[PDB]
Amino acid sequence: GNNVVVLGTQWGDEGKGKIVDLLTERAKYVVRYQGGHNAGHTLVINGEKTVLHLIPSGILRENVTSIIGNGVVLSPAALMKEMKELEDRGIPVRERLLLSEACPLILDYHVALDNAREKARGAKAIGTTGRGIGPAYEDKVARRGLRVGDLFDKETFAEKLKEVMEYHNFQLVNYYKAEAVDYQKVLDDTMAVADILTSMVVDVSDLLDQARQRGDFVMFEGAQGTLLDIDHGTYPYVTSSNTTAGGVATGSGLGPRYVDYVLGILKAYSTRVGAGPFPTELFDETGEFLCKQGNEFGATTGRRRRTGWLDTVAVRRAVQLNSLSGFCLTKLDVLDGLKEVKLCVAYRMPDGREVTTTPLAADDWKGVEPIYETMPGWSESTFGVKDRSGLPQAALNYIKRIEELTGVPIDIISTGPDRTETMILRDPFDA
Amino acid sequence: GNNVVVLGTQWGDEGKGKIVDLLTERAKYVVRYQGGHNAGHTLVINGEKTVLHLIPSGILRENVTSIIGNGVVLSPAALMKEMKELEDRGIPVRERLLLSEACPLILDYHVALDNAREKARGAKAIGTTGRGIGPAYEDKVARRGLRVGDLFDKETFAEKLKEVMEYHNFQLVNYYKAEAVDYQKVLDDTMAVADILTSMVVDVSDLLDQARQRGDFVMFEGAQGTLLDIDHGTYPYVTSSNTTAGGVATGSGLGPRYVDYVLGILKAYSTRVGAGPFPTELFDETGEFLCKQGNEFGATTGRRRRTGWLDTVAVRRAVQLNSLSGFCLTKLDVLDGLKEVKLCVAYRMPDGREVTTTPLAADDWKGVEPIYETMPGWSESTFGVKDRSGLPQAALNYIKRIEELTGVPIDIISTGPDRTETMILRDPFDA
Numbered sequence A, B: 001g002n003n004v005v006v007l008g009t010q011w012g013d014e015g016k017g018k019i020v021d022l023l024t025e026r027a028k029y030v031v032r033y034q035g036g037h038n039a040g041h042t043l044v045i046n047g048e049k050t051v052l053h054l055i056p057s058g059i060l061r062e063n064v065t066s067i068i069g070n071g072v073v074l075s076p077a078a079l080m081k082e083m084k085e086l087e088d089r090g091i092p093v094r095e096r097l098l099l100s101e102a103c104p105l106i107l108d109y110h111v112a113l114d115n116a117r118e119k120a121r122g123a124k125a126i127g128t129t130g131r132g133i134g135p136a137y138e139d140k141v142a143r144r145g146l147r148v149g150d151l152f153d154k155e156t157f158a159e160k161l162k163e164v165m166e167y168h169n170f171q172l173v174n175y176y177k178a179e180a181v182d183y184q185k186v187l188d189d190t191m192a193v194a195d196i197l198t199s200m201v202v203d204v205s206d207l208l209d210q211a212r213q214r215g216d217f218v219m220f221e222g223a224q225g226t227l228l229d230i231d232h233g234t235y236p237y238v239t240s241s242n243t244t245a246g247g248v249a250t251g252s253g254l255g256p257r258y259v260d261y262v263l264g265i266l267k268a269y270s271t272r273v274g275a276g277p278f279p280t281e282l283f284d285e286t287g288e289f290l291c292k293q294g295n296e297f298g299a300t301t302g303r304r305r306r307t308g309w310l311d312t313v314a315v316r317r318a319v320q321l322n323s324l325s326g327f328c329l330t331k332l333d334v335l336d337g338l339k340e341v342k343l344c345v346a347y348r349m350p351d352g353r354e355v356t357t358t359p360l361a362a363d364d365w366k367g368v369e370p371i372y373e374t375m376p377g378w379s380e381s382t383f384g385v386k387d388r389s390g391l392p393q394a395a396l397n398y399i400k401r402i403e404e405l406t407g408v409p410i411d412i413i414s415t416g417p418d419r420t421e422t423m424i425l426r427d428p429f430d431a
């Protein structure tokens, strides 16, 4: 359909980057609706060589308008760095990007809090959380934060900013024993950027209503994996916001009924970064094989990604939560060379009961044992294949089995980083 | 449609109590998806006049299951009361209600933290004081708060609580200079009933999915009013949670594409309780007539009930937000006898431009001039009519001016307080 949602169906790192660049070639509007400066996108597919964490890759294409919805927490410092960075590369960012007046602002004290929490809690163990994304979401729901619209009335901004800073400084020094952030400095850093940010503000709700009825192709883009959904993922091993397709309405202002197609990116195997339940995790050279052939090193500074077989039970939960229309399968070639391949079809519970549904957070994620289905592997390479006929029989059976177990089709298959090394079986836009 | 979502399209008080009760006759499931114990639905029961603020109205219906989704902040204290009230009136609540384990819990400290927050920045003014819904969400967001699901391990629960209580006690004592909530008083109160709640729990998204395949009739019930939306409302004049249809998915776990029909209840004229922009407020004798005639003297919930003509411009926005399917014109009987009726169609901004869209929820509302469309009225009584023929000819014109102005049809018409005083022109369930 005309309005499409693209998101990861697992726990992150599924390989959505390329698909997004590919599908952004046909879109008029590209919209961010959740998370913050944690998108992660290394430009290669037409993009020089840089990682954008806030602005969408649609910012490269001259025919598209990139929109940052209200569901996105906005750090004025992160943005300006990315802009000037692109502007240095001659990309006219300020005339191709639009923002919502309701986007919460991430500010020095928000980062300051995160850095202390990562200290206060536990201990120094690769504290990769000092971003300020969660704290901006807290101030919002608690109704004491600031938004972009607030930058319209500079007088009242100072007033508001002082009241909220006083409160954060209190806990910073009297509870955390950290340093106090300086109010005047933050007011100054913000004031100097205000005229710029407001020149981009637009009524995002009304604009999309226009695109929809006019019939334009709008691509909605998710940034974190589905199972990290604050509400339905593995609590507390979840993010600070909703990551499923259900977040498109609140994070952008459009009605839930105006979601046509929902494309879910599925990697051929499993990976998790950090703590949290993971039944299919492999603690052998297979897990190793998958880690090395998949470049699953996405965790620099003494860290790593957990590896494993595809878990159709967990994926089933994603289908449910995201009302997925189709799947896009990635990293299938990582499997080339495996004598046998496995697929988790059911979880066995402690009392011997087998179930096809994910455990109620408060349950046996700890006691569940994986019911595997083992199937033949392949020796021939799949990398770069551009037609289903280039695929061996075993890989074709794997793919269809996923479909049977899951009940949803695989409408796109990516066999390599090149645009043409893609198999579009249905096309999200024109179907 | 099997999946019907019901909700007020303005600022609350749109008169939805009767509609929800009516649709409840054909619903198999009635779901609460957002807000907390401030979703008041008054109703007669056994000669006694009780009001429910948490439990869905379908609790009376014999074969209806009432479900409190994860998007709702739960207050056990406020749950036992209602329950105790109805189980006394002879109704088997424990057997007709179910609830999500992912529901954040609202405890004494939350209210403590709420109270202080108002009487503080607002001795003889405004703030947040009250229920403790927002402090309850802020915790969900920071990833500290507890969930029904925690109740399964009575010991893990104890330690979790001690920690959060320490963090919050510090705040109240040092930052606030308020009394420090007793950890054991809370512990004892939550354990006194842990096992009642853990026994009404169910996997709600898996359930609603089962229902969606067997084609059962599910109704979703909103609590507040669209324009009070935390994100898309008249900021800063808004409430705690989201109020649009966007939250049915996030708040219950149901996929976006499964929302079939969104009924937006809409009052025949406007009212607002408390401070906030209100471009159609009347300051003449008509305003007093609507107030009086509609018995709006803070009757349902109002410490100050302002009134005005219908704001088609603001109503247009409510359509975008919820992707409404149909309206339910309410209280038209309150307009009988008016020599003339008005509907607002555009706003004149203080800069002299005229606009048909909700100016940014941060511009110059108090300075906006509404362009009024004047229309002839009716001397006849519309109060009590049961068929759309015994209705005047001016009343139908009004009804049509609204339809064309919003692009959405009216499918039900409440012509009075008694259930039978209803004209279901289309019925959401068969639609």
Ligand SMILES: Nc1nc2c(ncn2[C@@H]2O[C@H](COP(=O)(O)OP(N)(=O)O)[C@@H](O)[C@H]2O)c(=O)[nH]1
Residues within 6 Å of the ligand: B013, B014, B015, B016, B017, B018, B040, B041, B042, B043, B300, B330, B331, B332, B333, B334, B414, B415, B416, B417
């Ligand atoms: N006169 C009149 N009163 C109505 C109409 N529809 C609802 N009411 C009344 O106006 C008030 C509206 O609030 P309501 O939602 O019913 O209350 P609740 N939330 O169920 O307690 C109630 O008295 C209701 O009975 C109508 O068309 N005409």
